[PDB]
Every structure is written in C-alpha cells, then in structure tokens.
Amino acid sequence: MPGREILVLHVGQGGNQIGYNFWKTICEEHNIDIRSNQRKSVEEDKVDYKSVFLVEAPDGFHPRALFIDLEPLAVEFLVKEMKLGSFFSEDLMVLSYSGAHNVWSIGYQTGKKLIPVILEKIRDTMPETLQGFLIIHTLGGGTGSGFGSLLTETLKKEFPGKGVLNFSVLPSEVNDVTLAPYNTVLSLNHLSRFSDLVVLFDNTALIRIVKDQLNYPVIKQFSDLNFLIGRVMASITASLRFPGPLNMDLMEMAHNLVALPETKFIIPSVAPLTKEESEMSTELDLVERCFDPTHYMVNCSGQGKTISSVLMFRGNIAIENAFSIMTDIKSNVAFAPGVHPDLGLKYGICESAPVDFDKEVTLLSNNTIISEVFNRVLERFDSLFNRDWYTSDYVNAGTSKSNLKEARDNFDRIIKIYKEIEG
Ligand SMILES: Nc1nc2c(ncn2[C@@H]2O[C@H](COP(=O)(O)OP(=O)(O)OP(=O)(O)O)[C@@H](O)[C@H]2O)c(=O)[nH]1
Ligand SMILES: [K+]
Ligand SMILES: [Mg+2]
C-alpha cells in the first residue's frame, strides 16, 4: 500500500559517509544484499514494509536517497572502497567539482546552483505519498552545514505538509575545524526556522561510546563511528518497516517531542551496544542506560532535565515490563519542573530486533541540557566574532557580519527558551 515513504538526502563528506552505515543497516535488516540489490533469500524474507526506505524495481532494490556534495572525492572514494557502485548509483549523485572550503556561506550559495537538478530528481522519483525527508549532514564543515541548511529551507518551502527531519553532527569538544562555530550557529539558526526535528550527535560522545561501551581497540575509519548514527536512524523507524504492537511515524514522534515550537533539538541514545548484553539485560536496565549521559550521543555534563522523550522498544520485549517500569523512570530520571508525573513518555514497540540482538531500546530526548551544549557553541562563536576573525570569506559569499550577528542572537534566544523551561 502506497504511503509512508521517506527520501534521505546525504550532504557533504560526513553526511555521505554516514550514509554508507545507514543503508548497510537498512539492507541487512530487510535481508537485502547491498552489493547485488537482491533479497538474500525468499525463505528468510520477513513480513515487512521495504518501501519506507527502499525502491523495488524489477532488477532489485535501490535506496530512496540522493548523494550530494560540492566536491567529488568523499563520495567516489567511499563508493569504490565499500563497493557500492550498483546501490549508490550515478543517477542518485549530485556532485560538483570544488568544495565549500569549510565556509557555510559558500556551501549555501554554491548549492543554489544545484537546487534545480535536485528538485527535478525528487519530483521525478518520489511517490505522491512521500511522507517527508531526512537530511544527513555535519554542521562543522561548509557543504553539509550550508548546503544542508539550504536544502532544509528549500524542501520545507517546496513541500509543505511533508516532514523535514535533520540528523546533524555537531563538532567535537575541541573543534577540529576552527570555522565550526560560525558554521554551526548559521546551521542551527536555519534549522530552527525550517526543520521539524533536529536529531543531534557529536564525535566526542561517539568516540567515547565506541571506546567505552564497545571497547573497540582502534577506530581506523569513520565507519567504526557512524554505525551508531545508522543504528539510531534505523531503530526509530523500525515500527514503520516491521510488525509490532505499537507503531509510530516521523511526525508522530516530533509531535510528542516538541513542547514549544522552538524546542526541536533532540539528543539520541541507544542500549545495549553489543549482542552479548542484549541477551543479559532487562527492559529496565536498558532504559536506565539510555537515560545515562554515558550513552547520550551528544557530549553532556549530566542528565539535564528531560522535557519529553520517545522510547522505541525493539525485539523480544516484555510489554508488562515496558509499562511497569514507567513509574521507575519518572521517579529516577530528572524531568523538567513543569512535566506532570504521568507524562513525558512516548512508546513505540516493534517485534523486529536489530541484527543479532535479542532486544534494544532507543531514546530520543528533548532535554534542557542542550542549552549547555549550545552555550558552549555560542561562547566559541563569540570568541571569534568579537575579534572579527575568519569573517572575510563569509562576507565575500553573501553572509554579512550583520547576518552573522542576527543568526547568533536568534540562536541565543533558543538557548534561553530551553534554560527557562529548565527552571
Ligand atoms: N561522525 C562523523 N563526523 C564526520 C564525518 N566526516 C566528517 N566529519 C566531521 O565533520 C566536520 C567536517 O565536515 P565535513 O563533512 O568534512 O565537511 P563538508 O560538508 O564535506 O563541507 P566542505 O568539505 O567544507 O565543503 C568535522 O567536525 C569532522 O570531524 C563522518 O563521516 N562521521
Ligand atoms: K573538507
Ligand atoms: Mg568536504
């Protein structure tokens, strides 16, 4: 039955490198071989809804995706190294020849030139019942940040009534791009206006999880980091793709999360991280891990105060435990002062476990501690802007110093909304 289809837009180096892990997970969950485009078997094919992310053509399955960058190397090198040539196919690529040089404004203005072709591919490919778009991107560079922002604006304006969700990577605690505060503030200002829900990650938190929860001995490629983002993307959409007692769609989760129109910035977490612990944990233990800052995929100093939350239970779930632990969650986790004791929780329950695991819980948290995360971004921004450092090539590409300032001040207003709710 037509409907509920999603189109995924990958933007810049990080956004497309993350794409590899996402589509690899999606294919595996649906018993599809990403190298052949085919089901691995009829016998292991499951009752599912492949069409949420996958297009079934006579020849096989393809991603409902666009692979977008202003320079070609990250995508081409990725496609060759991972042998994705028949899945990340050429008609799905929108690649130019010179990057944005880590400047948001260059990503935004150069990206305008490619909007016609992107809109044409969208209207050429998508079904009428498309429910919305996911935009995958980093905020610290210039293409994912500026072109990603432009895409968020363009899609929301071109397709009112469809969802626009962003999966957005914040810079690490010490930034690895000195321009990142400018790019991050400009991006979050744009997404605050045009996105319906912004799910955030940062690399400090992701490395900590991989090193301390998975105990990987070394991280040699971003694939050994991005898999965590793929996992969050796949699990929160699982009840759209597999049977379950209690399903939920994109705007349903946003509606439950967004208490005030500006509070749309979400911290995700998942538990457990391994197959062995999924066999040896309870629903209570997994939820408590999700609410613990060790499992937050944004680097936070503490639990903060939860305004609202979405919990996806996947796999071999005792429904009576899922409900019975609700009072323990409301008692043991700090919620914002205005949250009623009986509120702040939204449940999805899906019978399909992630690959190899017995069960898994994913948490999306609308948490006041994002004000601390954003304040630290703002402090970095101010240390540059107050000295007029690095502003020249924003100005040359159409972002005036006044524009930088208004983006900063609107960013500050969102921070203050979260801090006021915190109490
Ligand atoms: N988690 C994660 N972070 C990434 C990845 N690739 C880049 N980054 C981070 O993203 C930021 C740099 O952004 P890029 O994606 O390289 O920039 P871009 O969008 O391609 O834009 P330009 O190169 O400036 O044109 C830095 O903070 C990197 O550490 C990735 O694949 N995964
Ligand atoms: K770069
Ligand atoms: Mg790049």
| Resolution to 1 decimal place, in Å | 1.9
CB 111 within 8 A of CB 151: yes
Domain regions of the chain by residue span? 1-266, 267-369, 370-423
Q: What ligand 1 atom has the least distance to the C-alpha of 101?
A: 24
Q: What ligand 1 atom has the least distance to the C-alpha of 100?
A: 25
Distance from Cα 168 to the centre of ligand 2, integer Å: 16
Q: Give the integer Cα–Cα distance in Å for 152 and 166.
A: 8
Distance from Cα 294 to the centre of ligand 1, integer Å: 23
Farthest CA pair distance, the chain? 65
Q: What is the 3-state secondary structure (H, E, C) of the chain?
A: CCCCCEEEEEEHHHHHHHHHHHHHHHHHHCCECCCCCCECCCCCCCCCCHHHCEEEECCEEEECEEEEECCCHHHHHHHHHHCCCCCCCHHHEEECCCCCCCCHHHHHHHHHHHHHHHHHHHHHHCCCCCCEEEEEEECCCCHHHHHHHHHHHHHHHHCCCCEEEEEEEECCCCCCCCCHHHHHHHHHHHHHHHCCEEEEEEHHHHHHHHHHCCCCCCCCCCHHHHHHHHHHHHHHCHHHHCCCCECCCHHHHHHHHCCCCCCCEEEEEEECCCHHHHHCCCHHHHHHHHCCCCCECCCCCCCCCEEEEEEEEEECCCHHHHHHCHHHHHHHCCECCCCCCCCCEEEEEECCCCCCCCEEEEEEEEECCHHHHHHHHHHHHHHHHCCCCCCHHHHCCCCCHHHHHHHHHHHHHHHHHHHHHHC
Taking alpha carbons only, the member of 170, 150, 76 closest to residue 106 is: 150
Taking CA atoms only, the protein residue closest to ligand 1 atom 4 is 14
Q: Which structural technique was applied?
A: X-ray
CA dihedral (42, 43, 48, 49) in degrees, to 10, reads 0
Distance from Cα 177 to the centre of ligand 3, integer Å: 12
